[PDB]
Design an enzyme around this catalytic site. Structure first.
Site, PDB file in Angstrom:
ATOM      1  N   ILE A 278       0.845  -1.187   0.000  1.00  0.00           N
ATOM      2  CA  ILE A 278       0.000   0.000   0.000  1.00  0.00           C
ATOM      3  C   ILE A 278       0.882   1.240   0.000  1.00  0.00           C
ATOM      4  O   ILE A 278       1.960   1.268   0.604  1.00  0.00           O
ATOM      5  CB  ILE A 278      -0.949  -0.028   1.215  1.00  0.00           C
ATOM      6  CG1 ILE A 278      -1.648  -1.384   1.293  1.00  0.00           C
ATOM      7  CG2 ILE A 278      -1.981   1.087   1.122  1.00  0.00           C
ATOM      8  CD1 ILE A 278      -2.336  -1.640   2.613  1.00  0.00           C
ATOM      9  N   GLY A 279       0.420   2.280  -0.690  1.00  0.00           N
ATOM     10  CA  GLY A 279       1.146   3.531  -0.758  1.00  0.00           C
ATOM     11  C   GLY A 279       1.298   4.037  -2.176  1.00  0.00           C
ATOM     12  O   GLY A 279       1.266   3.252  -3.129  1.00  0.00           O
ATOM     13  N   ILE A 281       3.961   5.270  -3.614  1.00  0.00           N
ATOM     14  CA  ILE A 281       5.190   4.771  -4.214  1.00  0.00           C
ATOM     15  C   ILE A 281       5.042   3.330  -4.681  1.00  0.00           C
ATOM     16  O   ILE A 281       5.568   2.973  -5.738  1.00  0.00           O
ATOM     17  CB  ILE A 281       6.370   4.895  -3.234  1.00  0.00           C
ATOM     18  CG1 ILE A 281       6.466   6.319  -2.691  1.00  0.00           C
ATOM     19  CG2 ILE A 281       7.667   4.547  -3.936  1.00  0.00           C
ATOM     20  CD1 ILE A 281       7.425   6.462  -1.531  1.00  0.00           C
ATOM     21  N   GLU A 302       2.718  -9.229   1.619  1.00  0.00           N
ATOM     22  CA  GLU A 302       1.753  -9.251   2.710  1.00  0.00           C
ATOM     23  C   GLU A 302       0.346  -8.905   2.231  1.00  0.00           C
ATOM     24  O   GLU A 302      -0.612  -9.615   2.549  1.00  0.00           O
ATOM     25  CB  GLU A 302       2.182  -8.272   3.806  1.00  0.00           C
ATOM     26  CG  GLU A 302       3.655  -8.338   4.167  1.00  0.00           C
ATOM     27  CD  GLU A 302       4.076  -7.212   5.092  1.00  0.00           C
ATOM     28  OE1 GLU A 302       3.887  -7.344   6.320  1.00  0.00           O
ATOM     29  OE2 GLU A 302       4.599  -6.194   4.592  1.00  0.00           O
TER      30      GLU A 302
END
Lengths: 526, 526
Positions: A278-279, A281, A302
């Site tokens: 997640i994110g 980037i 994950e």
């Protein structure tokens, strides 16, 4: 409690239909100081009915701060965990969290928090390492697991997340099951390894990302289960944040680095298993790899997003293994419109297996995680702001960076403050909190460049990081600090990893006192 | 020239007798800037003839600083490496060393040194990570390996150490073999795992300490071997240091802790594989376990000493696995007088297997390491003195401590200076260098007490460490620092891991300026 036909369809174990109870009917079971376990990961698959009933009971009887539990969850829970921290219903929390009320309560001393590697938290919980003071031979008083279906033998089929559910079921005195009838059955995706303690452990027979065991359900003792609660609430996942041009630059640097690695033979043309999450980037890196004409990719991570689903559709990604899948309602529609194809291209595992050093090191995973700050000697901060303020917890980053074939960390070169648009520097003389040491990091990437830290001495690492990743506004400061430290160490015969402990944390103190890390002058050192 | 009859007996490959050469005859093969690999571990099993020939050649032609090599060894080498650093014959060294001249040269900037996990250094070397600037598709120009015997297929049977010899042989352009005829053959006690790179890796089939593979030699290409040098020089192992009453107190605390663990069922009556090595504290702990009526113990460590031989004789210890065995000449006589009973209770493995996270975590190893300093939040320093001065290197401590079921660190509570008998405190407000983070350590032991840090928040960890392990002369200082930091963090809502970055390194600065860490007062914080 007119046992809805949907509930009858989901649960295929006849005795379990006699243990159906409403959420508010389980209130007397819960007492102050108990150890509770929750199924779920990164906010998906967490129980909702029982926590909501508990919150309502606390509000009705004004039990704020008098009815508290030691909450153990596999990873960060959803908004339900926020509302417990808002009502002071948590004594201790481990090992991860994402909520803002939770972080505020932890940083105000209202909640005791210790974070731990996601691959070892359930394992060490099964050893009794966290319930030492208990005298009644128990570990967890209750585990609350969300299920999507129940097999014919009474086993539990999880939802979009597995987490530490197997270990929690193993070490729980009683089990509470929520059968989520608002989400379609996730049966067939999960590959669940039931924990075995030493000296009875056997090797994991997995050689690839798509090797399975045939166990797609958690074996639970039918006598342990005390209640079956019907849940109609769907997971609430925020929409993804579009990537910005700081993330696209990072992704371009990473893509060029990967092309160079494949050119020299250090990586195969199809690369190796990746762990992206997640994110902004992470989404930018996935998009850059997709646009880089990489094919037959594999993922051992994950958490998955909608980003990897596009890879599945366009054929850039072959198979994905994760502890949980975290995707929105449109993602639900996209996946369930193609359920048969989705099933054969994703495998959900427990967090002890996904983050295990054995599998990560055997498969040659490529690790990519974001630090709070990295000092010039490649020690990374992932949890504490200025060394004290908890942000989210260590998570699985430590598990993945030490074991991965390539350990890559990507962060912005600088971050703004209220006074200076570049008031915070990600590159500092010394990190106020070390989570990933210099022995784990291999590649450091910012929007300014890429630093290749493999096989470099600390001074070489410092020069490389300052040259490539440091922001232009802080390059002069970092170079001056390093030169002064090198001179002082030459005087005192400590030139291996030169430092000025008197000036090491001056960026942080200057940020605290003036709002910017840009220091006017260093204190003299004899 | 004639070949020795003893050499004929040791080598059983007929073509290798045509490659027998004296040590001084290999001088033209070595050139400046080459990458050299040495067999050996902790100073045992290292080559001696070729390094001495190189030293003599440098002395004769005055090539000090003009004939230098990038030296890669599995671990610390013997006195041969010291004489190389004394003549400036090393450009880069990795990942471990014990010599005083080596540390003097590294800390003076004459040698570039980077240390790395002992389980990952040979692996990342096989990936070409440390030879990234080479353009000729090589990794190591020469691997120099000491042998005790050569099988009928030309494979090498190592000596008392294995180390990174398999990987070094794998990635070497040419191989030089010293057949050590002055030491008896170590054939039969080796279990060699030839490295395989992803994505072609298979699980290690080992379930117990004594599980083997049947490969007791290192396969080599017979064309790669360029010379066979006869070595008649034994390893020079210093005599062991008797335990003192600071180490006996530590051992007693650990023995009581182990009794408590077995009493509560968290450990079996026979305990689990142990990781104990060199040092007065390690010998004291071994003797304490021996006198504690523990039986059928097993050891999965890096290095064995002559201490474990007593356990072998008296029946306290059943089997032992280590990368190397490091014991004195009287130990040689004792072991080889009973070679049959010693062969059947020791297995020598490669350092990639001994220190592998997979085996350590599967077997439930109990790790016991000695830190330089541990701060009140359980971040341990193992390498750098005051954050700059290299002592020995990280070694295998990081591999064991993160993966071990029980992570134990034992250090003296305080150390003397020239001015104060307790001028150095092992417990400090903040560690100047973090090698093992708070996510790895479980038990901290000093001569004052035992701190049990399993499942504790950072403030609880700080209170426990100050109460149990802190020296009485520094308990007041550490408590005052923690109270001031807690007040400051309560003021600015960062009470998770409270710190005063302005005063964090005042112990070390005060030690530098006044010779003692006992600070008179702290700088005020707003």
């Amino acid at each position: 409690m007119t046992i809805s036909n949907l509930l009858k369809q989901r649960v295929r174990y006849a005795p379990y239909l006699k243990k159906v109870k409403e959420a508010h009917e389980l209130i007397p079971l819960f007492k102050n100081g108990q150890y509770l376990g929750w199924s779920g990961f990164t906010g998906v698959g967490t129980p909702k009915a029982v926590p909501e009933a508990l919150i309502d009971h606390v509000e009705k009887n004004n039990l704020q701060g008098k009815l508290r539990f030691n909450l153990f969850v596999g990873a960060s829970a959803g908004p339900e965990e926020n509302r417990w921290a808002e009502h002071d219903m948590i004594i201790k929390r481990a090992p991860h969290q994402v909520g803002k009320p939770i972080a505020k309560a932890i940083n105000q001393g209202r909640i005791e928090f210790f974070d731990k590697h996601l691959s070892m938290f359930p394992q060490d919980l099964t050893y009794g390492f966290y319930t030492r003071e208990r005298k009644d031979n128990k570990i967890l008083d209750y585990t609350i697991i969300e299920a999507t279906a129940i097999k014919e033998d009474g086993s539990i089929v999880p939802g979009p997340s597995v987490g530490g559910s197997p270990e929690f079921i193993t070490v729980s005195d009683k089990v509470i099951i929520e059968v989520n009838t608002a989400t379609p059955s996730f049966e067939g995706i999960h590959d669940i390894d039931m924990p075995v303690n030493p000296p009875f452990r056997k090797p994991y027979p997995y050689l690839k990302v798509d090797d399975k065991c045939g166990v797609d359900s958690i074996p639970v003792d039918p006598e342990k289960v005390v209640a079956i609660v019907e849940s109609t609430m769907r997971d609430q996942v925020p929409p993804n944040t579009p990537s910005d041009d700081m993330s696209r630059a990072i992704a371009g640097h990473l893509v060029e680095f990967f092309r160079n690695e494949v050119k020299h033979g250090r990586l195969p043309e199809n690369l190796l298993p990746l762990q992206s999450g997640i994110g902004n980037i992470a989404n930018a890196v996935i998009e850059g790899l997709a646009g880089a004409q990489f094919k037959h990719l594999t993922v051992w991570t994950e958490v998955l997003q909608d980003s990897f689903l596009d890879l599945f559709e366009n054929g850039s990604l072959d198979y994905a293994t994760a502890t949980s899948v975290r995707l929105t309602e449109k993602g639900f529609d996209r996946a369930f419109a193609n359920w048969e194809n989705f099933k054969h291209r994703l495998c959900l595992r427990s967090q002890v297996v996904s983050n295990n050093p054995e599998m990560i090191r055997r498969l040659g995973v490529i690790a990519m995680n974001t630090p709070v700050e990295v000092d010039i000697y490649a020690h990374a901060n992932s949890t504490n702001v200025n060394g004290s303020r908890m942000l989210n917890g260590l998570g699985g980053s430590a598990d993945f960076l030490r074991n991965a074939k390539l350990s890559i960390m990507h962060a912005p070169s600088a971050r703004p403050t209220k006074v200076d648009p570049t008031g915070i520097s990600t590159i500092v003389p010394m990190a106020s909190h070390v989570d990933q040491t210099e022995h784990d990091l291999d590649i450091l990437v910012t929007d300014q460049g890429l630093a290749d830290l493999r096989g470099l001495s600390p001074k070489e690492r410092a020069r490389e990081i300052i040259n490539k990743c440091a922001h232009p506004d802080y390059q002069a400061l970092l170079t001056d600090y390093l030169d002064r430290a090198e001179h002082y160490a030459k005087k005192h015969n400590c030139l291996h990893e030169p430092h000025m402990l008197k000036n090491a944390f001056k960026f942080h103190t200057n940020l605290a006192e003036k709002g910017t890390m840009k220091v006017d002058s260093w204190e003299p050192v004899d």
